[PDB]
Backbone atoms as SQL, in Angstrom:
CREATE TABLE atoms (id INTEGER PRIMARY KEY, chain TEXT, resi INTEGER, resn TEXT, atom TEXT, x REAL, y REAL, z REAL);
INSERT INTO atoms VALUES
  (1, 'A', 1, 'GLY', 'N', 0.862, -1.240, 0.017),
  (2, 'A', 1, 'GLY', 'CA', -0.093, -0.062, 0.097),
  (3, 'A', 1, 'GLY', 'C', 0.794, 1.388, 0.015),
  (4, 'A', 2, 'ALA', 'N', 1.027, 1.890, 1.162),
  (5, 'A', 2, 'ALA', 'CA', 1.933, 2.945, 1.358),
  (6, 'A', 2, 'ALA', 'C', 3.053, 3.017, 0.503),
  (7, 'A', 3, 'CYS', 'N', 3.760, 1.773, 0.352),
  (8, 'A', 3, 'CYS', 'CA', 5.045, 1.784, -0.347),
  (9, 'A', 3, 'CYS', 'C', 4.740, 2.052, -1.953),
  (10, 'A', 4, 'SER', 'N', 3.593, 1.872, -2.356),
  (11, 'A', 4, 'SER', 'CA', 3.006, 2.122, -3.588),
  (12, 'A', 4, 'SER', 'C', 2.364, 3.674, -3.697),
  (13, 'A', 5, 'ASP', 'N', 2.552, 4.399, -2.730),
  (14, 'A', 5, 'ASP', 'CA', 2.069, 5.731, -2.633),
  (15, 'A', 5, 'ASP', 'C', 3.113, 6.660, -2.326),
  (16, 'A', 6, 'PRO', 'N', 3.387, 7.594, -3.368),
  (17, 'A', 6, 'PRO', 'CA', 4.555, 8.656, -3.255),
  (18, 'A', 6, 'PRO', 'C', 4.618, 9.220, -1.750),
  (19, 'A', 7, 'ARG', 'N', 3.155, 9.311, -1.445),
  (20, 'A', 7, 'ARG', 'CA', 3.049, 10.041, 0.042),
  (21, 'A', 7, 'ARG', 'C', 3.593, 9.254, 1.099),
  (22, 'A', 8, 'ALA', 'N', 3.550, 7.946, 1.102),
  (23, 'A', 8, 'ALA', 'CA', 4.286, 6.975, 2.175),
  (24, 'A', 8, 'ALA', 'C', 5.556, 6.628, 1.643),
  (25, 'A', 9, 'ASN', 'N', 5.814, 6.279, 0.501),
  (26, 'A', 9, 'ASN', 'CA', 7.158, 5.818, -0.175),
  (27, 'A', 9, 'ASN', 'C', 8.160, 6.841, 0.386),
  (28, 'A', 10, 'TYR', 'N', 7.791, 8.118, 0.245),
  (29, 'A', 10, 'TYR', 'CA', 8.778, 9.168, 0.756),
  (30, 'A', 10, 'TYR', 'C', 8.818, 9.462, 2.192),
  (31, 'A', 11, 'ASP', 'N', 7.678, 9.169, 2.710),
  (32, 'A', 11, 'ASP', 'CA', 7.700, 9.183, 4.057),
  (33, 'A', 11, 'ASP', 'C', 8.299, 8.088, 4.954),
  (34, 'A', 12, 'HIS', 'N', 8.178, 6.872, 4.413),
  (35, 'A', 12, 'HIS', 'CA', 8.748, 5.731, 5.027),
  (36, 'A', 12, 'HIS', 'C', 9.700, 5.104, 4.128),
  (37, 'A', 13, 'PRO', 'N', 10.853, 5.921, 3.410),
  (38, 'A', 13, 'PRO', 'CA', 11.802, 5.402, 2.625),
  (39, 'A', 13, 'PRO', 'C', 12.200, 4.050, 3.316),
  (40, 'A', 14, 'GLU', 'N', 12.661, 4.116, 4.520),
  (41, 'A', 14, 'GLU', 'CA', 13.109, 2.930, 5.382),
  (42, 'A', 14, 'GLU', 'C', 12.538, 1.561, 4.839),
  (43, 'A', 15, 'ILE', 'N', 11.087, 1.552, 4.543),
  (44, 'A', 15, 'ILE', 'CA', 10.467, 0.474, 4.175),
  (45, 'A', 15, 'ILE', 'C', 10.511, 0.329, 2.560),
  (46, 'A', 16, 'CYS', 'N', 10.184, 1.319, 1.889),
  (47, 'A', 16, 'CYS', 'CA', 10.331, 1.385, 0.359),
  (48, 'A', 16, 'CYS', 'C', 11.766, 1.146, 0.080);
């Protein structure tokens, strides 16, 4: 989910 969302991907780089 979030990892597929620029909003999360950039907020949670650690995971992405």
